[PDB]
């Protein structure tokens, strides 16, 4: 019958993306695709078999509209009146990694497997990374004609 990956089956890879003025949505959808594993033919939703992702120049992310300063990230401690919010600009100039992370985390399942996937997401505010000893494959986001 149909094929189901066993234990000694997975083959991993470390991909690396540039965020040089890429659109956040494109970038995040691509990363979600890769991490969840919708690009290999061995896909199975019960298994995590995607690929590690390394994002760089994440402080170069540029969005459209007034979303830099009219858009409001929110949180809530749980206490009363403990709703506190932030723009996107403030949040870049505080820590840029979180914008791209949360953007991607909303493009994944919020289940156990999703939590076990977020482990496979590494993001760095600069161009660099300590993960050169995996020789990361550059990914260039492309669109297939039909």
């Amino acid at each position: 019958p149909t094929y189901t990956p066993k234990a000694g089956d997975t083959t991993r890879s470390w991909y690396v993306i540039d965020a040089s003025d890429v659109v956040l949505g494109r970038l995040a959808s691509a990363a979600a695709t890769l991490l969840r594993g919708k690009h290999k033919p061995t896909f199975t939703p019960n298994v995590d078999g995607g690929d590690f992702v390394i994002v760089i120049n994440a402080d170069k992310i540029a969005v459209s509209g007034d979303k830099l300063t009219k858009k409001f990230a929110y949180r809530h401690s749980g206490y009363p009146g403990g709703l506190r919010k932030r723009t996107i600009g403030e949040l870049l100039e505080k820590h840029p990694t979180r914008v791209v992370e949360n953007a991607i985390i909303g493009m994944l399942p919020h289940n156990k497997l999703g939590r076990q996937i977020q482990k496979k997401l590494k993001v760095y505010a600069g161009p660099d990374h300590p993960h050169a000893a995996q020789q990361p494959i550059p990914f260039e986001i492309k669109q297939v004609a039909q």
Binding site: T2, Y3, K38, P41, T42, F43, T44, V144, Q146
Partner: protein, 124 residues
């Protein structure tokens, strides 16, 4: 004339409670609680028997599409092409090919490339 009722009940009790070895709590000990869960259980089995078809077909399609897109063609146009070419292989088996032998699948991809219309967005 007086008919004690013991046997005639014990029968179905034994049946049910044999069929609920794996359930967790009062669903695994007690007839009035396992009967209900048997109703729900057989029903959910029925429904899943009707729907695992769509489940597997979804799976097969995701595999096919990712394989193709790594060979730089979309799913929709692949199936347009095979329909045009009269090729008969179903999706379970296209997926099996994708897993095992990507070469043959790439050959089929190439067939569809050949057999598609020239101007796909034409008004024909």
């Amino acid at each position: 004339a007086r008919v004690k009722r013991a046997l005639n009940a014990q029968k179905k009790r034994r049946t049910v409670l044999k069929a609920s070895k794996g359930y967790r709590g009062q669903r695994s000990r007690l007839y009035r609680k396992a009967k209900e869960q048997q109703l729900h259980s057989l029903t959910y089995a029925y429904r899943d028997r009707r729907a695992r078809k769509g489940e597997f077909r979804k799976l097969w399609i995701s595999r096919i599409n990712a394989a193709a897109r790594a060979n730089d063609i979309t799913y929709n146009r692949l199936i347009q092409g095979l329909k045009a070419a009269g090729v008969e292989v179903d999706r379970k088996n296209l997926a099996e090919l994708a897993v095992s032998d990507p070469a043959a699948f790439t050959a089929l991809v190439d067939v569809a490339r050949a057999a598609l219309p020239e101007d796909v967005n034409a008004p024909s």
